[PDB]
What we know:
- It is classed as hydrolase/hydrolase inhibitor.
- 2 copies of one chain form a homodimer.
- By secondary structure, chain A is α+β, with helices and mostly antiparallel strands.
- Chain A has a domain at about 195-294: main proteinase (3clpro) structure, domain 3 (Orthogonal Bundle), CATH 1.10.1840.10.
- Chain A contains 9 helices and 13 strands.
- In chain A, strands 5-4-1-2-3-7-6 form a 7-stranded antiparallel β-sheet, with no helix packed on it. In chain A, strands 8, 9, 10, 11, 12 and 13 form a 6-stranded mixed β-sheet that branches.
- In chain A, a hairpin with a 2-residue loop joins strand 4 and strand 5.
- The N and C termini of chain A lie close together (about 10 Å).
- The interface of A and B includes residues 10, 112, 122 and 280 of A.
- The structure holds ligand IS5 (2 copies).
- One copy of the ligand *C(=O)[C@H](C[C@@H]1CCNC1=O)NC(=O)[C@H](CC(C)C)NC(=O)OC[C@@H]1C[C@H]1c1cccc(F)c1 binds next to strand 12 of chain B.
Amino acid sequence: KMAFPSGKVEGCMVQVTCGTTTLNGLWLDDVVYCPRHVICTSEDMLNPNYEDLLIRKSNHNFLVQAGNVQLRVIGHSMQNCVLKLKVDTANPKTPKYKFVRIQPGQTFSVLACYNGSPSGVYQCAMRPNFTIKGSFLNGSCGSVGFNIDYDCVSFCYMHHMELPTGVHAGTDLEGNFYGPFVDRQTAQAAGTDTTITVNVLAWLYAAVINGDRWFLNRFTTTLNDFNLVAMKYNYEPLTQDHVDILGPLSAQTGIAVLDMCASLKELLQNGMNGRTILGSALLEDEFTPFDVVR
Amino acid sequence: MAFPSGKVEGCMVQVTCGTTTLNGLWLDDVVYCPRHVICTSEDMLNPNYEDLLIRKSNHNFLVQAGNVQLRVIGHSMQNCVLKLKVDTANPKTPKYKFVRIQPGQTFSVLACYNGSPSGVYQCAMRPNFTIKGSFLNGSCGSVGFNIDYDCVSFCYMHHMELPTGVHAGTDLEGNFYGPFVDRQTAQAAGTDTTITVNVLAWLYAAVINGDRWFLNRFTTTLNDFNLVAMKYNYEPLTQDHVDILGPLSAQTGIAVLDMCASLKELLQNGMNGRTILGSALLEDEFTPFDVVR
Ligand SMILES: *C(=O)[C@H](C[C@@H]1CCNC1=O)NC(=O)[C@H](CC(C)C)NC(=O)OC[C@@H]1C[C@H]1c1cccc(F)c1
Ligand SMILES: *C(=O)[C@H](C[C@@H]1CCNC1=O)NC(=O)[C@H](CC(C)C)NC(=O)OC[C@@H]1C[C@H]1c1cccc(F)c1
């Protein structure tokens, strides 16, 4: 697992405090983005009226700091589950950036932060049930997930909560949660998780590129036939987008995506028969087709 | 999980000599890079580096930091690292130190190509003084490091891939880790061993994640455990290793030698299918300090 260099995101991290509640914010040009539950108390986390907590609030109740230096808040609004604080200084370290909503299966780096300070960077996969298996502790909220393409940081994740089971949930940078979660301090269950088929196929491609190709067969399949069988093994069905992002690996190896699906269908039905693929009896599902190139 | 890489990204530059390009580290007014940049092909196999270095002019070295060229006003060599004095001081130079790490210790690697950061990841110095990185052509000069408060401890610079696919390099004084040499030859490492204290830290970790199917009631002396460990090419466990595991022992209520008893069972049986924190294999590149923080 290889994360993206974090320096461009580090230069954007700040801290936002309401009362005693401190979490992290993302400072881009003259706007600071953070999770709205920074405005909550204990007495109101069990179920908050965010619209009502927000009316009581004024610009001068928001403490925003880069380091120990205060940024003056000159405006505030709420977009879904994210708070947007307008500040009086444009971040001179603002990279080229966009806000993207990723699909389940896709990977991203997360810059874990506490009190506006980075502690670590690591590589996460958005599971099909819209959770990530991270290392977030208290005060990690507002940490973000991202990919870097050339000069451009694509922000895709902001952290909000840990689930009873120990995995994590959050939103895009527009405040829309990934999955069926809500930012209330209630017990919330992630739907049952499935294996990320497109990434397994990416991994088989990687194994072929490295000369490990015992598992290829002379058969092929339809996308519908493969999908129905894979769901019987708790694999995700494939979309048309999945097929398309396997194109470069299909072209590199000369093995059509549906031929690879047929090889996977056989692995699913018969098993490995005590063999390995890239030195592993387990099919890895957290390397995307873009990750394999790198 | 790796250290944030921003402080190091701001030091990475591109160094070129001839048709060879790799990365350099630019601290204050000196750029450090692997000396084999001053090579060719007729040289690859048995290079007399002092000899090739004396034939070199300051102006043969092209240093680019972003869109900017840096003027080399001086060059010297410290073991396998070339030190290029340049006419400008990097203003992004962080607080730093140069350190040589011990096998079993971990560090972050910022992989760079043509002076540009491309990825970051966490590695351990294997006991045979290799590292299991993903380095491709042109990644030479990439560095490994740790961060303590505001200070970057640099510990590795990347020089070569071995034919098995693992990697070899030097500290920032240019001394290789391991018996490797910066000549273009197929080199083998000594037989690698598994970092025992790290496997134990990682088992304590899975426990903290409420994963404990591997535990047991059996127990073991420290010597009897080491006898089994050595049998399976695991590093011996020292009493310092035991002391270091204390915090994780306290936090889980599992004595160090109880976890050793658990590890002994796993080595002799196997996992018999089951898995620990996702892995079918015992993971040995998380240290105790790591798993804490
Ligand atoms: C950031 O503020 C923080 C990050 C959490 C803390 C621990 N690990 C993590 O990711 N997020 C919260 O505290 C969040 C605030 C809500 C308003 C969304 N709540 C949360 O994450 O709760 C975590 C424990 C598992 C929750 C739970 C279990 C059972 C019953 C509950 F009501 C809640
Ligand atoms: C950086 O310049 C580069 C990094 C390597 C390239 C491929 N992956 C990687 O990490 N370092 C070298 O190319 C290095 C230069 C020497 C002069 C030290 N040589 C190298 O990495 O060789 C790799 C293969 C195992 C070498 C080999 C096999 C057979 C015969 C040989 F003579 C050498």
